[PDB]
Design a protein around this ligand. Sequence first.
Ligand SMILES: O=c1[nH]cnc2c1ncn2[C@@H]1O[C@H](COP(=O)(O)O)[C@@H](O)[C@H]1O
Ligand SMILES: [Zn+2]
Length: 340
Amino acid sequence: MEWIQSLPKIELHAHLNGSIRDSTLLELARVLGEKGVIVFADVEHVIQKNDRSLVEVFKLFDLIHKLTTDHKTVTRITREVVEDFALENVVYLELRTTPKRSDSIGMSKRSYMEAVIQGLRSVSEVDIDFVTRKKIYVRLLLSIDRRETTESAMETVKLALEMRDVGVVGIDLSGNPLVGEWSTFLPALQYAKDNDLHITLHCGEVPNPKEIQAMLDFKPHRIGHACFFKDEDWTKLKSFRIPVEICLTSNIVTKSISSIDIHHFADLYNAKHPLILCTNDFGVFSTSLSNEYALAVRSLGLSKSETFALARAAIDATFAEDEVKQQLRFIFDSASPEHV
Ligand SMILES: O=c1[nH]cnc2c1ncn2[C@@H]1O[C@H](COP(=O)(O)O)[C@@H](O)[C@H]1O
Ligand SMILES: [Zn+2]
C-alpha cells in the first residue's frame, strides 16, 4: 500500500541506460534536436510509441545510446539513477552498464566507466558508499553485450578487474538474446569467474534449450529472467541453487510471460528457491522497485512480514563483500519490527 515504498530494498538488476528519467531523456533529445544532430519529433515519437516487445526494445536502446553516449551524460544519469533508487529506500544497488567505445569523442570503455565513477562522486542528495538523510550502498557490474566479440568481452573483464578499487564486483551477459552464441562469451566469463568476479547471466529470455542448459552448467552466481525454462531447466536450477533476478513488469510488457498470475516467481517462492524482485529498466518499462514489490505482494497475497523476509533474503544474493552484507543485516534487523 504505502509501507512498500518505506521497505528497505535491494536492487540487483538495473541497467543504467534503461533507468533514465523520461524528462532527462527528452531534455537530451531536445538539445540534440536543437543542435540538429537528430529530428526531435521522430525520436519523441519512438520513445512514445515503441511497444517495448522484446524485438522493439533493442531498437529503443539503439535510440537511447545515440542520446546518452557522452562523458557528461553518463555522469548525469549515473547520479540521477542512484538518487531515484535511494529516494524509494533502496539501501543496496548493483548498477549494471555496458562500457562503450566512441572514437569521435575519445570515449573508451575505461573513460566511460570513469564517467560512471564521477557520477557516483557527484551524488549529494543521499549518502553513498560505492567502495569500502538516506544512505545507499552502490556496487557496479560491467555488462558484456551479446553483439560483442570474445576479445571485446575480455577487455570488459580486464577493465572490471582493474576497477575493483571503485566498487566493481561482477560481470553480466545481456543485450539481444536473439544475437550471438554462448561459445563466444563462455571463454571471457570463465576468465572472470577464475579471477573471482561474480557472474550474472540473462538466461531463457527466448526459447533456447541448449543455451539455457549451457548457462546453467557454467554455474553463474545469479541469472536474470528465466522466462522460457522447461522442466529439465527448473530441476537443474533448483539443484544448483542459483538465485533468479525476477523482472515482473519487464516480462509482461515484452510478452515474455503472458500474465503475473502464471509468472514462475510464484513457483520459485513456493519451492523456497532464492529470487530477487528487480526493475530491469525502470525508465523503459515505467516502473519502480516499490511497484515491482506491490505487483508481487498482490499476486502472491503476501503479508507485511512475509514481504519483509523476501526483501531481506536478497542480502546473500548480493556480490558485496561480507562487511557490506553485515551492514545490510543491521539495516534490515533495525526495520523488522515495523513489518507485521
Ligand atoms: O531486458 C533486457 N534484456 C537484455 N538486455 C537488456 C535488457 N534491458 C537492458 N539490456 C541491456 O542493457 C543495455 C542498456 O543499458 P546500458 O548497458 O547502460 O547501455 C541494452 O543495450 C542491453 O544490452
Ligand atoms: Zn534485462
